[PDB]
Design an enzyme around this catalytic site. Structure first.
Site, PDB file in Angstrom:
ATOM      1  N   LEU A 162       0.793  -1.211   0.000  1.00  0.00           N
ATOM      2  CA  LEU A 162       0.000   0.000   0.000  1.00  0.00           C
ATOM      3  C   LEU A 162       0.836   1.276   0.000  1.00  0.00           C
ATOM      4  O   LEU A 162       0.391   2.308  -0.514  1.00  0.00           O
ATOM      5  CB  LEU A 162      -0.943  -0.012   1.182  1.00  0.00           C
ATOM      6  CG  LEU A 162      -1.903  -1.175   1.029  1.00  0.00           C
ATOM      7  CD1 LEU A 162      -2.529  -1.529   2.352  1.00  0.00           C
ATOM      8  CD2 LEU A 162      -2.940  -0.779   0.032  1.00  0.00           C
ATOM      9  N   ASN A 204      -7.665  11.168   5.708  1.00  0.00           N
ATOM     10  CA  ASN A 204      -7.633  10.105   6.697  1.00  0.00           C
ATOM     11  C   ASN A 204      -9.013   9.700   7.165  1.00  0.00           C
ATOM     12  O   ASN A 204      -9.170   8.837   8.028  1.00  0.00           O
ATOM     13  CB  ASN A 204      -6.724  10.480   7.858  1.00  0.00           C
ATOM     14  CG  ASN A 204      -5.256  10.343   7.490  1.00  0.00           C
ATOM     15  OD1 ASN A 204      -4.920   9.649   6.533  1.00  0.00           O
ATOM     16  ND2 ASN A 204      -4.379  11.003   8.242  1.00  0.00           N
ATOM     17  N   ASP A 257      -4.698   6.645  10.182  1.00  0.00           N
ATOM     18  CA  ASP A 257      -3.473   7.381  10.541  1.00  0.00           C
ATOM     19  C   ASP A 257      -3.707   8.290  11.748  1.00  0.00           C
ATOM     20  O   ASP A 257      -3.708   9.508  11.627  1.00  0.00           O
ATOM     21  CB  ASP A 257      -2.935   8.198   9.345  1.00  0.00           C
ATOM     22  CG  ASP A 257      -2.195   7.346   8.308  1.00  0.00           C
ATOM     23  OD1 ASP A 257      -2.850   6.614   7.526  1.00  0.00           O
ATOM     24  OD2 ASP A 257      -0.950   7.446   8.259  1.00  0.00           O
ATOM     25  N   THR A 285      -2.694  20.896   6.233  1.00  0.00           N
ATOM     26  CA  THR A 285      -2.881  21.913   5.203  1.00  0.00           C
ATOM     27  C   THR A 285      -3.207  23.225   5.863  1.00  0.00           C
ATOM     28  O   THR A 285      -3.909  23.237   6.882  1.00  0.00           O
ATOM     29  CB  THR A 285      -4.086  21.622   4.299  1.00  0.00           C
ATOM     30  OG1 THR A 285      -4.465  20.242   4.405  1.00  0.00           O
ATOM     31  CG2 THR A 285      -3.772  22.017   2.829  1.00  0.00           C
TER      32      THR A 285
END
Length: 311
Positions: free
Chosen positions: A36, A158, A171, A176
């Protein structure tokens, strides 16, 4: 009701933290399908458990690299916490084990993809649809804070969708520009409250289709955040406009969830009248969107056994 519940989830979590579960499976119980992605210590693999046919993400960790990079402590702690927590809406660590070479952490695998995939597809969510998600997030947050844990950084990538149309928060960081909180920008440090800002921004983007503050340059963005002037789209319900006003409070002391009344200011607000918090938690609520239906070199002898005994 819930006030009774979380104290037992806390009582339960602390029981597990005090006595961690170790070595709960082994490498050959699973088939390795694809990679992944990669961390610093090994790749992460989509694996299917031979017995249950279930799918999982297996994070692999080269004990020796973890040592070289002085990350023993963080890792052991990441695991300890992870085996300890158990919440419907958080991706769970289902198995952990170790062999001569590597450390393995096996996560729940979420097929359904990002909810933002759906947001971007549709354009923007109806207020009830978005309420649905908001609700889970709200609970999650409440839950983390009870354990004196903070979510902090909103990465909507996520937020994934399970087989049933609910959220799993993958996670989880426990070690951002547009989603940054005022205090952070002001280098004022932070606390449980930033999460409600996040929640605020999130609801907004869901309901609006776009983030509340946005600009050309980052500097212009921060200004808007810190300024604490938010324009709302014509269609936002009054209750929505009002809630977000309270959530996107620059004044940390005036921000919902951080008040004396705590997280309960939020659950009770008018826009959440229609919400059965229990039913949502239960997962009994009908979800608006259901989704469409590699060699490991291990050493013959054990390395860094000493360091990872706790694992």
């Amino acid at each position: 009701s819930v006030k009774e519940f979380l104290a037992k989830a806390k009582e339960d979590f602390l029981k597990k933290w005090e006595t961690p579960s170790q070595n709960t499976a082994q490498l050959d119980q699973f088939d390795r399908i694809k990679t992944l992605g990669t961390g610093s210590f090994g790749r992460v693999m989509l694996v299917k458990h031979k017995e249950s046919g279930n799918h999982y993400a297996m994070k692999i960790l080269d004990k020796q690299k973890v040592v070289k990079l002085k990350q023993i402590e963080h890792t052991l702690n990441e695991k300890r916490i992870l085996q300890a927590v158990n919440f419907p809406f958080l991706v769970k660590l289902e198995f952990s084990f170790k062999d001569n070479s590597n450390l393995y952490m096996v996560m729940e695998y979420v097929a359904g993809g990002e909810m933002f995939s759906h947001l971007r597809r549709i354009g923007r969510f109806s207020e009830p649809h978005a309420r649905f998600y908001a609700a889970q997030i709200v609970l999650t947050f409440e839950y983390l804070h009870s354990l004196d844990l903070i979510y902090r950084d909103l990465k909507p990538e996520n937020l994934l969708i399970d087989q049933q149309g609910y959220i799993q928060v993958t996670d989880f960081g426990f070690a951002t520009p547009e989603y940054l909180a005022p205090e952070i920008i002001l280098s004022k440090g932070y606390n449980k409250a930033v999460d409600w800002w996040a929640l605020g921004v999130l609801i907004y983007e869901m309901a609006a289709g776009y983030p509340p503050f946005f600009a050309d340059q980052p500097i212009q963005i921060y200004e808007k955040i810190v300024s604490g002037k938010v324009r709302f789209p014509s269609h936002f319900s009054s209750d929505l406009k009002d809630l977000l006003r309270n959530l996107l409070q620059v004044d940390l002391t005036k921000r919902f969830g951080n008040l004396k009344n705590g997280v309960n200011d939020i659950k009770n607000h008018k826009w959440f009248a229609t919400t059965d918090w229990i039913a949502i938690y239960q997962r009994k609520v009908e979800a608006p969107f259901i989704p469409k239906f590699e060699e490991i070199r291990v050493s013959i002898n054990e390395k860094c056994g000493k360091e990872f005994t706790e694992f």
